[PDB]
Structures are given as C-alpha cells and as structure tokens.
C-alpha cells in the first residue's frame, strides 16, 4: 500500500489595458497551471484543458506541453472549468477545477491557488512520474 501527494498551482494575472481593443476589451489576462518552485509537472501531466466563456472563439483551449497557459483579452471575469489530465493508464485519469478568472478595476491583479492531489496505490510507473514532479508518498 502507498499514497502519493503532489502540488499544483493554478493562477492568473490580469492587467487593465491602457488602450482597449477594437472589440471594447479592457483587460489582458493570462491563466496557467504550473508546478510550485522549480517542479516540472509535465512528468505526470498529459494535457491541460481551459474552458473559456463561449464569448471567446474556440473556447475549449488545450495545452499538451508546457507552459500550460492561455493568454487573452476580454472585458469581464467569469467561471472557468480547468481539466488536468494525467499520464496514467488507470483511474483517476484527470482532475477538474472550477477557476474564478476575475478582473479588477484598480489595475493590476495576481492570483495564485495551491492545490494538492493525492493518489492512492498508484502504479509504480505513475508513482515515479509523481515523485519526479515533486510528489510525496504519505501515510
């Protein structure tokens, strides 16, 4: 028996444009999923799916390799499902987050959300992937 814990960071930044875009978009924002502190999550992460509001074109954005991030311009905040799929050949194959992509009016915004995943009795190949990315076997 064996249990592994590994950390992901979800974040975004948002800046109020000095000049809005032609469509009237007031902000530049960027959303990402990364490993903390030098850790590389590509070892166990197969792809990240960012589901953008359907006002955006091709709202289902996919990154299959780092950096796992979406850069965009818009005018309001919105709820953004985020799927992180794993390099696993058994369940669980993905985790889903509900991310609040919010913009403020005062100008500069940075947000960071620290998530912790636990995998119970992973295969030994997947376990190696987890640890190479900064994971932790536990009680």
């Amino acid at each position: 028996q064996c249990t592994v814990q590994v950390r992901l960071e979800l974040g975004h930044r948002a800046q109020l444009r000095k000049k809005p875009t032609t469509e009237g978009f007031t902000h530049d924002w960027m959303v990402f999923v990364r490993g903390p502190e030098q850790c590389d999550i590509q070892h166990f992460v197969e792809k990240v799916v960012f589901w953008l509001h359907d006002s955006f074109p091709k709202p289902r954005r996919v990154c299959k390799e780092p950096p796992y991030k979406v850069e965009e311009s818009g005018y309001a905040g919105f709820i953004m499902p985020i799927e992180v799929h794993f390099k696993n050949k058994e369940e669980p194959r993905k985790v889903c987050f509900t991310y609040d992509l919010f913009l403020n009016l005062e100008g500069n915004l940075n947000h960071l959300r620290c998530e912790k995943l636990t995998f119970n009795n992973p295969t030994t190949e997947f376990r190696y992937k987890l640890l190479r990315a900064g994971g932790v076997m536990v009680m």
């Binding site: 509001h53 006002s55 005018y75 309001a76 905040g77 919105f78 919010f102 913009l103 403020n104 009016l105």
Partner: peptide, 4 residues
C-alpha cells in the same frame, strides 16, 4: 468588478 465586471462579470459575465
């Protein structure tokens, strides 16, 4: 803050 604006929302959609």
């Amino acid at each position: 803050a604006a929302r959609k």
